[PDB]
């Protein structure tokens, strides 16, 4: 059965990205929606729509490709998993691809990027890497 | 070829209907294969049961001679 919705959402993006799809639709949740919003703010995806319905909602994500159809998102990794959680100290918050990518940490301040969390001297669960 | 039963709207094949059944057995009494008679898969199975019931009740022969 479904065990890691966050991982599953990342995989939908990875798979859709791999075949240069324009858009994908992810079943929504509060945490998945926050991750999607970071990707837009950080310029990894084009746009994100939240469609309501009777069920839990759908996130339509529009992927972003440069000139020459180049994929902006090169890779996505799930770090914290249901089987092995990963929490980081404020000073041990990882940089991703030597600062060319981002890491998404869930903190008590909110769901931030690595840079944002570092400025607040906050740690927390390291959700994913994106580069 | 087309299935005789779907064409004529035959829902229930019956082992009693010997005259109909006899169109599906060979000269020797062998049940003709579906590939040769064009019957639908579903109706071939129903038809096979009918012939076996008929052969049991002496309406059709097992071996013609």
């Amino acid at each position: 059965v479904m065990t890691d919705p966050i991982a599953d959402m990342l995989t939908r993006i990875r798979n859709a990205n791999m075949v240069r799809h324009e858009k994908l639709e992810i079943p929504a949740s509060k945490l998945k929606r926050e991750i999607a919003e970071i990707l837009k703010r950080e310029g990894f995806i084009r746009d994100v729509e939240f469609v309501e319905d009777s069920k839990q909602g759908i996130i339509r994500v529009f992927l972003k490709y440069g000139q020459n159809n180049e994929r902006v998102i090169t890779g996505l990794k799930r770090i914290s998993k249901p089987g092995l959680r990963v929490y980081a100290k404020s000073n041990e918050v990882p940089r991703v691809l030597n600062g060319l990518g981002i890491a998404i940490i869930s903190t008590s301040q909110g769901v931030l990027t690595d840079k944002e969390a570092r400025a607040k001297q906050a740690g927390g669960e390291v959700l994913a890497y994106v580069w | 070829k087309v299935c005789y039963f779907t064409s004529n709207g035959i829902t229930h094949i019956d082992y009693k209907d010997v005259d109909l059944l006899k169109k599906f057995v060979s000269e020797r009494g062998k049940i003709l294969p579906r590939r040769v008679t064009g019957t639908n898969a579903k109706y071939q199975r129903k038809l096979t049961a009918a012939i076996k019931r008929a052969r049991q009740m002496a309406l059709l022969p097992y071996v013609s001679g």
Partner: protein, 92 residues
């Protein structure tokens, strides 16, 4: 439930004996809480092959509605009798 009992009476009997047989076995079915919906009689047909050295027989076709118990009792008696040479119970 609806069953269709067909059976074959040996062809070497007179009409008096035949009617006796039919009444006897129809009574068995009804006796065990059945109800005879239909009763066709195909009459003497040529058997496809010899049964007990008989090339012909009288084909009866009794439709009934009954439980297991009723149809099973026909089977037992139909086998024992020497007049009925073959039978088949069939759910409809």
């Amino acid at each position: 439930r609806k069953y269709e009992v067909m059976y074959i009476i040996r062809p070497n009997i007179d009409e008096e004996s035949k009617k006796a047989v039919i009444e006897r076995f129809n009574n068995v079915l009804t006796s065990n809480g059945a109800e005879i919906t239909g009763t066709k009689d195909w009459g003497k047909r040529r058997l496809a092959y010899e049964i007990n050295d008989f090339r012909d027989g009288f084909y009866q076709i009794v439709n009934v509605q009954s439980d297991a118990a009723a149809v099973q009792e026909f089977d037992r008696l139909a086998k024992i009798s020497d007049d009925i040479i073959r039978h088949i119970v069939v759910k409809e």
